[PDB]
Nucleic acid binder design. Structure first.
Ligand SMILES: [Cl-]
Ligand SMILES: [Cl-]
Ligand SMILES: [Mn+2]
Ligand SMILES: [Mn+2]
Ligand SMILES: [Mn+2]
Ligand SMILES: [Mn+2]
Ligand SMILES: [Mn+2]
Ligand SMILES: [Mn+2]
Ligand SMILES: [Mn+2]
Ligand SMILES: [Mn+2]
Lengths: 104, 95, 92, 77, 93, 108, 85, 101
DNA sequence: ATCAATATCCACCTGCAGATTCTACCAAAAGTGTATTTGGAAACTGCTCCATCAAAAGGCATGTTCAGCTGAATTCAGCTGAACATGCCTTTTGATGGAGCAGTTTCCAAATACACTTTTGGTAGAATCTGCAGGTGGATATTGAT
DNA sequence: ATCAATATCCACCTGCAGATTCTACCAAAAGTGTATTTGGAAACTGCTCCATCAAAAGGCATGTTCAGCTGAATTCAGCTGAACATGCCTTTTGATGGAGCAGTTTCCAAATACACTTTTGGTAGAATCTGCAGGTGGATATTGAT
């Protein structure tokens, strides 16, 4: 009976709609705009959590922590460009030693 | 007596600290610095989470600046980070 | 009483990795991410509506904003999912 | 106070950045950059604080100051 | 058809600062761009300030905070002086 | 009916307060706009315009011409630290660049 | 229909790239700079033109305008002054 | 006899640096540039023969030439940092990675 | 390239404290059912502005030659920076008290919105004005060979 | 240290394309007058934040030794700058047709407004579980001598 359920979404269409009306974005908000925006947000969240669960169980854990999110984002070119001026608190950096610095 | 050659322990610490995510500046010196700068601008209080957020931002900024400057170091056929490298990286970034 | 996206992020995580969990700090990361992308899309859609002297933000402005803001394949998949949700919502 | 940013701490920051060998004049250089950075952020942060007529800067104030310098930070609300 | 611009006022201010200097049309286009850009910056930051603090009205206080946040140093000091002085003179009568 | 005075004249300004007010109310910035906010904004816009035109006139009569062209605006902005920071991600059409030959490249 | 446009990045001649380098202060130019510059210029143009025509077609037009180019540049953080019509 | 006159390598380059840093003209020929823009626009799927207003093409060329000139300044800083005098592809690519591109 | 001798890294364990999940309650959003209003889509239409067209001339792109200077490759000593042992003090951690300050409520006096109705400043051409582009030709500096 | 060869600079001039002024209309401020909001003034209250303290540890400051990097100095093959002849194609200017922007009107599919009913998301303990401190013990790398 909720708008999210009718669009087949987990993210909240009605809350997205209220945030749109109260964010001083436009005098009016159409019926489909919160549905479209909620769906896009749920998609991007799904992509990130997919890669982060993978990275978290690659290192023998079942708990997503910031480090897993950081490895996920930085190791994927399109996510990395989308979040290129964002810093993930306690996420550290990617392992990276320039090859000229190894012995031999 | 055992002694590692110069460089070996450095690469070990590179590996140790790039795999970790702990803050690398000690809390009290950093928060004391922050409060001093805040007063030298303004007698404000600080949320604890606010000081933690500041320190994360500052350490991330410094680490990425070191990465960029080291790219310049290696471009100049050196291995030793120098003040010129950091200054040129901040010119090229646009600061 | 403070709102957040934690409920829905946890739902999506259960969909994608049923037996993986998430720490409190990473949940804050995800809230920050959702709010950031929301402000990005909503702001771009607001500017689009204004450039063309329209007063209403419609799913067409959201779609153009997603095209402008996401890179490549991410934009294609987000547009597909958004259009699909609008269709299923209009059917019911 | 800027000397509380110790040389081993700057060394650690550099190692996270991949630097293998570190010149002796980097540390005071690093302190300089950090001071500028902190000033720019704190001036903006407390500005938000005093616009809301508060005497306590919050994490959200820091987040707004960072984002207005183009350095969005995740994790603090 | 009818297009508004800031050209009138840019030219008045030019005569105030440089009574015997003129301006080419391309340079006037630069100046129109400048006024619209700074307007958008200040107004956007003021909108964000009002929203952060759950106020529905953008007042001169939000304009002042945004001017402090967006302009550098001495520019910000002098801009605040001019704005405050204009607001007091306007409100007196 | 009383004599019509403009809001600009009551604020002692050249920039148009009423047009700034209309632009503020119709830009979807907030549900309401206070009376002094357009005055304050018009005054800041006029101040910054005066600063750029002051420095640009200086550059134009340094180059012995009486009309400001884009090159003068660019010299004005880039030769002033604070304007340069404020317009650091701005491109000025046909403004060129500042003369700058690094000293290492002059003959020995 | 128009005539067929092909291989146009080669119209960005070597002397034009030299002039651009001189305005940038470059005194000596390696022979491989010209193809690099063409690559970079094409990537830049693609990103901006893609965004510009997105604005154009959202406005239900068949004509790219100066404002469309201005909006696309500003969405890449490259504000341009002088073309506000 | 007589020798034909000849400037030493570097003199004319510094002459043209001076000449082009005091001027503001577009440095790419207009027509080839507009053909490049039109070709890229067509080769893009959302291009179904869009027209271009003249101001739009001038705006693009202004932006593209400012971008290239500043990229040359930055890359040349890197060239000089490497104790060289000849700009090389490496310098341009490193300059744009550090810029954030 | 090997061995022998350390040193460090890292995969794996346990018991459990601390972090999440799990329950249940409830203001506050979200949803519903009606009732009205209206923004902008369509459908003309008038007319700028783009797209080609053509021709002319003359500014430049191109291809070639060849020599000077540059990048690249090597060598190597002085001195900087790394590694490390020692012992000292700054930072951590924990407790306890209390101030002061962020939230919250309730009213209004003041401020702002909005519809109508004068009133004028601002805009679009026209009608005038006028720097300065774009020509000479001489003066003065710079460069490179001798 | 000079001269010949160029390059650059600089003053002066005029016609015209571009900039500045001038008119008249009219959209859009300004003025008026009611109708809605709202932003704090006082009055609280519970809780984060600061301020002292105190003890301890573990991280840092210091001094020593020396290995290896950086900057300097050399050498040289070949790449890139300079100069130039040739001729192509870019730039100008003007025309010509028509696409398609943009101005105007009409009218619903969609949006807003409002009064009420459900449903949810947030919160805070209770009930579960999971990393993690702090141990191995083998694997893997490093160092010095042959
Ligand atoms: Cl819609
Ligand atoms: Cl106000
Ligand atoms: Mn094509
Ligand atoms: Mn209507
Ligand atoms: Mn050399
Ligand atoms: Mn009048
Ligand atoms: Mn001249
Ligand atoms: Mn030695
Ligand atoms: Mn529930
Ligand atoms: Mn452990």
């Amino acid at each position: 009976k909720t708008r999210s359920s009718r669009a087949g979404l987990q993210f909240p269409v009605g809350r997205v709609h209220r945030l749109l009306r109260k964010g001083n974005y436009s005098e009016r908000v159409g019926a489909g705009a919160p549905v479209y925006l909620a769906a896009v947000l749920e998609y991007l969240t799904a992509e990130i959590l997919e890669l982060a669960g993978n990275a978290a169980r690659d290192n023998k854990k079942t708990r997503i922590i910031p480090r897993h999110l950081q490895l996920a984002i930085r190791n994927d070119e399109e996510l990395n460009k989308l979040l290129g001026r964002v810093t993930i608190a306690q996420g550290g950096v990617l392992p990276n030693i320039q090859a000229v610095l190894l012995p031999k | 007596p055992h002694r590692y050659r110069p460089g070996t322990v450095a690469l070990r610490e590179i590996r140790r600290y790039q795999k970790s995510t702990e803050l690398l500046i000690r809390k009290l010196p950093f928060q004391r610095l922050v409060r001093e700068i805040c007063q030298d601008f303004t007698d404000f209080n600080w949320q604890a989470q606010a000081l933690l957020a500041l320190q994360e931002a500052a350490e991330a900024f410094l680490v990425h600046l070191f990465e960029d400057a080291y790219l310049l170091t290696l471009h100049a056929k050196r291995v030793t980070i120098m003040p010129k490298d950091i200054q040129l990286a901040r010119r090229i970034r646009g600061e | 009483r403070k709102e957040s996206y934690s409920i829905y992020v946890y739902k999506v995580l259960k969909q994608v990795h049923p037996d993986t969990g998430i720490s409190s700090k990473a949940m804050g990361i995800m809230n920050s991410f959702v709010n950031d992308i929301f402000e990005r899309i909503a702001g771009e859609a607001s500017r689009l509506a204004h450039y063309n002297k329209r007063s209403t933000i419609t799913s067409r402005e959201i779609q153009t904003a997603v095209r402008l803001l996401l890179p490549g394949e991410l934009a294609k998949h987000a547009v597909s999912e958004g259009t699909k949700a609008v269709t299923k919502y209009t059917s019911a | 106070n800027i000397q509380g940013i110790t040389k081993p701490a700057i060394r650690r920051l550099a190692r996270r950045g991949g630097v293998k060998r570190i010149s002796g004049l980097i540390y005071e250089e690093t302190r300089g950059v950090l001071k500028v950075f902190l000033e720019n952020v704190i001036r903006d942060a407390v500005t938000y604080t005093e616009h809301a007529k508060r005497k306590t800067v919050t994490a959200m104030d820091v987040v707004y100051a960072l984002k207005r310098q183009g350095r969005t930070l995740y994790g603090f609300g």
